[PDB]
Structure 1
Amino acid sequence: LIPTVRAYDIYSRLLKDRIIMLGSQIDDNVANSIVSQLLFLQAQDSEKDIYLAINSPGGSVTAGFAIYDTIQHIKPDVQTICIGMAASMGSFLLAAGAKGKRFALPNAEVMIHQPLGGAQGQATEIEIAANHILKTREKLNRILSERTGQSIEKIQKDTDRDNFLTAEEAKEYGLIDEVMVP
């Protein structure tokens, strides 16, 4: 069910007020849509804040970077608000919001972990794939270090396995700035 509110579906109605809902796994389709919404909102008003609500298990790293770079590229501040869960690339995007404007609701879940992938074929193909995913992890960890204030060494350790954080723990970690208390 997606209700209608001239007619607008609920999400289009929120977009009118500069709210973007990232409420699914991140793939290229989702990233296309979010990027397009960000660019549209900048064109409508280059100064007013944008609000990106996040309830996502993560997904494609490259798709996530399409969103991440668009956020950093545009002029408006993008606030991030975790509702429900932000895992993997979802937590990376949560951490990518405007400094001081990254939030989670009190019972929201944040999870961080290393990237996942695969490789099949010849030894040299497997080597190329391994080197690529390792370089991707280095890139993710370096940016997370910059955005959280944690050292790269600590991020590497803390993302070796699935690491679940409460909203308060995410604030302490530097993934968000504030827990939005009711």
Structure 2
Amino acid sequence: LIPIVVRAYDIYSRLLRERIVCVMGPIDDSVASLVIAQLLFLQSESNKKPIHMYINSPGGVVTAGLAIYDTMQYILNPICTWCVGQAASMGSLLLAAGTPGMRHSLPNSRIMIHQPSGQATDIAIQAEEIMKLKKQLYNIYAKHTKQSLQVIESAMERDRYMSPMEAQEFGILDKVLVHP
């Protein structure tokens, strides 16, 4: 039951006019394909006007999440990340991949970087190869939070969520706002 706003759009097509790419729910190849297209389209309108990326996600397929991350680094626009409700697993990696100084979170959000043990693989993968994927998140997290590799590997072995202030000091987000 999606509404229509006023030439008349639906509320989700209107969100894209305000340069807002929506990432709600589990991440798969279909979500990654839709998100990457919105980013590439938004750069075609202007490669300097900022883009806001709303994240309320529990995670999902890693390669699908990495495709969004790789596209976030490709486009030249300033990328603003907003954590609403929760950003866990791959969701917190996209949250931490925003433009430095523009990664926000709402005051009552939860943030998880631990990886779950409901998909995460597309096909069946071998023992050495989930380790290579985990090492990829090890370096991406360390690069965007400016944390050491050992601190990152240690923190990701603990099954717990952080408050936006804990995530701020760790390096996932920059500002915790209740109001503009």
**Length-normalised TM-score, structure 2:** 0.92
Residue in 1 that maps onto 2:3:
3
Residue 53 of structure 1, CA deviation: 0.6
Conserved 8 A contact 1:51-1:80: yes
Check the 8 A contact 1:115/1:137 in 2, yes or no: no
C-alpha distance in 1, partners of 2:38/2:77?
13
Other-structure match for 2:58: 57
1:78 and 1:162 map into 2 onto residues whose CA distance is 29
**Do residues 67 (structure 1) and 68 (structure 2) align?**
yes
- How many equivalent pairs are there? 174
5+ residue gaps in structure 1?
Answer: 119-124
Output one character per residue of 1:77-100: Cα deviation in whole Å (capped at 9) or x when no partner. 110000110000000000001111
Question: Are 1:77 and 2:78 counterparts?
Answer: yes
Of 148, 151, 157, the match for 1:151: 148
For residues 27 and 59 of structure 2, what CA distance do their matches in structure 1 show?
A: 5
Does 1:91 pair with 2:88? no
Instruction: Name which one, 1 or 2, has greater alpha-carbon Rg.
Output: 1
Is the 1:141–1:152 contact (alpha carbons within 8 Å) kept by the matching residues of 2? yes
The one-character-per-residue Cα deviations of 1:44-87 (angstroms, maximum 9, x if unpaired) are 11110000010000101100011001110001011000011000
Determine if the alignment matches structure 1 residue 141 to structure 2 residue 132.
no
Distance 1:106 1:115 in 2: 24
Distance 1:28 1:7 in 2: 30
Query: How far 1:115 sits from its partner (Å)?
Result: 5.5
Q: Which residue number in structure 2 is paired with residue 164 of structure 1?
A: 161
Equivalent residue number for residue 173 of structure 2: 176
1:129 to 126, 130, 141: 126
> Partner letter of residue 64 of structure 2?
A
Distance 2:178 2:108 in 1: 10
* Structure 2: stretches of 5+ with no match in the other structure: none
TM-score normalised by structure 1 residue count: 0.91
Query: Shift of residue 158 of structure 1?
Result: 0.9
Measure, in 2, the Cα distance between the counterparts of 1:18 and 1:114.
Answer: 30
Q: Deviations over 1:98-155 (max 9, x none)?
A: 111101011011111136468xxxxxx9xx7111001111110111001101111111
The CA RMSD measured in Å over matched residues stands at: 1.5
